[PDB]
Amino acid sequence: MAVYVKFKVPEEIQKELLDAVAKAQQIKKGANEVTKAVERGIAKLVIIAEDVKPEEVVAHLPYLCEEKGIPYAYVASKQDLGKAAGVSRPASSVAIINEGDAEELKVLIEKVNVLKQ
Numbered sequence: 333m334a335v336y337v338k339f340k341v342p343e344e345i346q347k348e349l350l351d352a353v354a355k356a357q358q359i360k361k362g363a364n365e366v367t368k369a370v371e372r373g374i375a376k377l378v379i380i381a382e383d384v385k386p387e388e389v390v391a392h393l394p395y396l397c398e399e400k401g402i403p404y405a406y407v408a409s410k411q412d413l414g415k416a417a418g419v420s421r422p423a424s425s426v427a428i429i430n431e432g433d434a435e436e437l438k439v440l441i442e443k444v445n446v447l448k449q
Contacts, residue, residue, distance in 0.1 A: 336391045337382050337406055339448045346407045348440055349379050353416040355432030361417050363389045366425040370400050375427035377403050377441055381410035384424045393425060405444040 341349070353359060360369045369375040370393070378397050384390050397404040407413050410422035417423050431437040 334382060334384070334387070336380070336384075336387060336394060338394045339406075341406045341444070341447060343408075345405070345440075345443060345447065348443075349405055349407055350412055350416040352377065352428060352431065352437060352440055353379060353413070353426050354418075355436075356428045357430040357432060359417060359429060360427040361419070361423050361425075363393075363424055366393065366427045367396065369427040369429060370396050370402050373400065373402075374429055375402050376431060376437065377405070377428045377444075378425060379413060379428075380404060380406050380425045381413045381423065382406050382408050383410050389424050403441045403444055405447070 360366050366378060378393060380390050380393055394404055410424055413426060414421055414423040417426050
């Protein structure tokens with residue numbers, strides 16, 4: 333797996349992450365926008381595709397998310413992450429700013445945090 337992928341997310345949970353993106357009211361897309369959202373403290377959850385190159389587009393994200401106390405996780409395919417975000421081309425990363433469902437988001441974050449630790 334790519335060096336920036338710090339823990340394993342099961343397929344089932346990847347599909348839940350894509351759904352959370354797809355139902356979100358507001359998101360940010362791409363390394364620049366996602367980084368700003370995390371810096372500003374407004375990202376509630378960050379999802380990073382596992383097949384992104386070069387390394388410098390997303391490498392800082394796991395570290396920055398930890399520092400800012402923002403949960404993060406992974407999906408296999410940038411093409412899928414793009415589709416979930418409503419794009420017909422890939423997306424390297426996505427931040428959920430306003431989720432579709434607060435309760436679903438809380439539980440999903442909990443699962444991701446269990447997987448990470």
